[PDB]
């Protein structure tokens, strides 16, 4: 069981760490990526929400995640990418200056579906100018 944490300060860093996660050979692996640049928070949060829409995640969950991404005084996005036990999950936490955190999970049935989602996220982030 391995937990890695990174502070992500550019879009290229975000793409690099998704790659590192996929290529990590551990059976049980967790990467936690922290983003504090509000412009990058919105870029990446909107990309996750769009990827979730394409993946047919619960529409009300996506609507709530967009609400969090659009909220005033956003200060932190934390993305936890987890493969452990029988679970394949991405957790999204959006935090504001007042310390209020909204959290969301996106589950996958297997490893292949999770890596396909991560590749979708990379494609969406790559389109950004």
Residue numbers in the entry: 5 to 133
What are the paper's exact sentences on this?
We set out to develop a deep learning based protein sequence design method broadly applicable to design of monomers, cyclic oligomers, protein nanoparticles, and protein-protein interfaces.
We demonstrate the broad utility and high accuracy of ProteinMPNN using X-ray crystallography, cryoEM and functional studies by rescuing previously failed designs, made using Rosetta or AlphaFold, of protein monomers, cyclic homo-oligomers, tetrahedral nanoparticles, and target binding proteins. Incorporation of noise during training improves sequence recovery on protein structure models, and produces sequences which more robustly encode their structures as assessed using structure prediction algorithms. In protein design calculations, the models trained with larger amounts of noise have the advantage of generating sequences which more strongly map to the target structures by prediction methods (this increases frequency of designs passing prediction based filters, and may correspondingly also increase the frequency of actual folding to the desired target structure). ProteinMPNN solves sequence design problems in a small fraction of the time (1.2 sec vs 258.8 sec on a single CPU for a 100 residue protein) required for physically based approaches such as Rosetta, which carry out large scale sidechain packing calculations, achieves much higher protein sequence recovery on native backbones (52.4% vs 32.9%), and most importantly, rescues previously failed designs made using Rosetta or AlphaFold for protein monomers, assemblies, and protein-protein interfaces. As illustrated in the accompanying paper (Wicky et al.), ProteinMPNN designs also have a much higher propensity to crystallize, greatly facilitating structure determination of designed proteins.
